[PDB]
Amino acid sequence: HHWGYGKHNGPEHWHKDFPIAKGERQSPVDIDTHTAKYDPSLKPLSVSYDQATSLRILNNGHLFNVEFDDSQDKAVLKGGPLDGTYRLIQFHFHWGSLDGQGSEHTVDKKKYAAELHLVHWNTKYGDFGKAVQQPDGLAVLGIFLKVGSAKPGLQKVVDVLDSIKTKGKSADFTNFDPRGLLPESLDYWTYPGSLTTPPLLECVTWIVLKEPISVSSEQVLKFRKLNFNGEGEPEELMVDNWRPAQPLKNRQIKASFK
Ligand SMILES: [Hg+2]
Ligand SMILES: [Zn+2]
Fold first, then answer.
1. Whole-number Cα distances in Å, 254 to 40, 74, 105
2. The CATH number, out of the four listed (3.10.200.10, 3.30.450.20, 3.30.479.20, 1.10.10.10), of the domain defined by the range 1-258
């Protein structure tokens, strides 16, 4: 029936319902640090999240999304490789069943335990739905998570997971500050790509941060307790919801640092 991450409906089958899966600018990709072009003209990233307004958290059967009020420039991203302002609409994670896998992008083939995606849309286009019709409609900030010490700013999220265990459940999730999930440095790699889940639209300017954040093993364990299934159905743990690296093709990865 529909898409997932299993043997019968996983990433390798996606092309049947979404032909763009085999397109020219698909994500994720492996970041070869020795081939990435240092670009001195890349301006510093500008993350203005002081007015961020979170609204809800929801398990959609594939992963969980924390949604934000994007009716005004409350939480925006600009600078870096971007032209114009991009509004934060939601953030989600991709993780593995084990600590050695989970991230979508890899750095010199290295896989992290998880990857956080903060999705933004170009205000120039009015709304998210119109933004996904443009080659520069979206900007996703990717942050790697590695297992180590606990991330205080992630605990609020971890605590609420019990209430949205199954597919379709949602919970109010207000007053959450996304600044607590940012690493110290804002150095990054950037390249043009796509969303990593169907519809796999090629509308994304990826900004992948060099420095990962650390979360405890207990924090990641909570992620693995979520369910792909809806309430009452046989239990399928939500793990390994990541897409493998796609061919880079006619693309260049640029770094904002040396
Ligand atoms: Hg697009
Ligand atoms: Zn994602």
1. 10, 29, 15
2. 3.10.200.10
